Amino acid sequence: SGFRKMAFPSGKVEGCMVQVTCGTTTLNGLWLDDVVYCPRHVICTSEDMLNPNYEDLLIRKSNHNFLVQAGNVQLRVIGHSMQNCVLKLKVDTANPKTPKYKFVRIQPGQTFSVLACYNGSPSGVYQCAMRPNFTIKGSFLNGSCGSVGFNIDYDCVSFCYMHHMELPTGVHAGTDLEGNFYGPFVDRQTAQAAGTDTTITVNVLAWLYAAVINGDRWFLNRFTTTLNDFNLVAMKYNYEPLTQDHVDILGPLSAQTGIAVLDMCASLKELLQNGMNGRTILGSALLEDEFTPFDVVRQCS
Amino acid sequence: SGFRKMAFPSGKVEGCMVQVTCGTTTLNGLWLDDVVYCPRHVICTSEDMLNPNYEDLLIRKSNHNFLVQAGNVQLRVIGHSMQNCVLKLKVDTANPKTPKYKFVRIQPGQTFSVLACYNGSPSGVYQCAMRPNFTIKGSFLNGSCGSVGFNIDYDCVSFCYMHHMELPTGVHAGTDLEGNFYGPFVDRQTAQAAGTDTTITVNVLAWLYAAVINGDRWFLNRFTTTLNDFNLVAMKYNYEPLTQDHVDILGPLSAQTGIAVLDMCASLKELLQNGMNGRTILGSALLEDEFTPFDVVRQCSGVTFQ
Ligand SMILES: O=C1C[C@@H](C(=O)NCCc2csc3ccccc23)c2ccc(F)cc2N1
């Protein structure tokens, strides 16, 4: 038993991290087969911060302008192309440590592990959720761009995030591995701001089910609710709407614990009304929204 | 910016995990050089588990009674011996992925990364602190015994924990890699309980420094305190004593943020007496005690390990 914020083991990703240099700019890239993926903004100069013309900047570069280092070894860049906001550098060596992998684009509320990296070298690993406002609440310094987010549900690594930038509120924005930004953000230093963030309701419910599976019962109650009346209350606390999809997804945790979804919804209503009154749930004094239904089942049963 | 609970990258340890089977028991072992380390309780049956004679159980076993699998390969066990509560299985092949490593024993309040494993396969990684009562608040299911805890200091892995059991309250107990238990526990099925725990004061201060570095400053105040006066209040709240060594270790964060340790202690005093009054620190409504001073400096300065 026990319940922890838990990341995937990072070894399969660690063997794919390389350092990418263009001019005076160094950041991280992701070496899979014979391609290195990194943020296209690596090619930008101080001049080009606000309105880079990436097509124009790229055509001006040759292969030998890109220095890629894997450990102590330089790789030879033999091609370059851009896909949306990621740069793809063809290199003359396939990565012998390439794992089984795929690229997936995720939806808000999904969780993943981040391998934070500097100068092509792993620094640490933590867990994040894609926020409803399409930011992530990461831990990233200067040098971290090109760090990736991933899941590993069997032996296949699913890459779902590449890090591009920090917004003024200290939260983070980035792309899928096809270079499409999550949310309305762009890889320019023009003023942009995250929308107001909301709580991931389906994940909170999942975490309440985790608490019950781990023997915590104190917050339950004899009430139920309609889905609509739940949503009307929840929105007033800046909670995302709970949809029928979400109710369906909670079905297995509902059946394992004997507590119907709308019954647990009423428990959440009460917690929002009353707070915790000196108590904790799974060691937390706030409601946790960065565990999905899938996470709870995986870690518990 | 940002501050997260962050584990060490686990790859160097992933390449050392194997599966160990004895009879109907399967659990995890750690393969380094030509030895596989695992909990000695692997040799026990249900009858034995109440009052095991490990010496006696072991002498009855042959090498071929231990099935060790590294991926889909069987290793050949060519020797077996016990050191405290860990079993050492000599095998005929050195682990080609053996990293630079050492065995260290940690002190309560020190943190480490746990690589949770099942059937010799790593499943997850998280950060833990050794509690003052010598338990860890882990997440472990049946199959997890032999999972290990570690730090990385450079390119050197320091192994500091092996998982042996869950106590009735749902917290966890284990040994160093020399087989000595952390805390007053034994590897048998009998009544055992965690002592009452305390809060790791130096780590809370470290986390308050992390908060300030990340722009969270509401709890700061004009006041300072003495080490003695702080310790009288801390003891009253089931906080560990703060020593001069702790003050010294916080010196770097004190100088970087402009907030002396005893000045931050006055913030902590007020929080204990008054609570947080609806507010949060780094998104938490309770004081976090599972980041050391070293952890905060590492994460706020971006140290790496290729
Ligand atoms: O997560 C990070 C990384 C990195 C960053 O935010 N952004 C990368 C730059 C960038 C975005 S659009 C565009 C167009 C041209 C050239 C550069 C860019 C950073 C720097 C300083 C600091 F204090 C914190 C962080 N945090």
Ligand SMILES: O=C1C[C@@H](C(=O)NCCc2csc3ccccc23)c2ccc(F)cc2N1
């Ligand atoms: O952390 C865990 C692992 C594992 C566990 O604690 N095994 C302990 C076995 C053991 C300890 S001493 C001794 C002497 C002889 C024979 C067995 C033993 C477990 C099983 C089921 C469950 F629901 C939870 C957990 N939690």
Ligand code: NA
């Ligand atoms: Na690397």
Ligand code: NA
């Ligand atoms: Na209810």
Ligand code: NA
């Ligand atoms: Na003060």
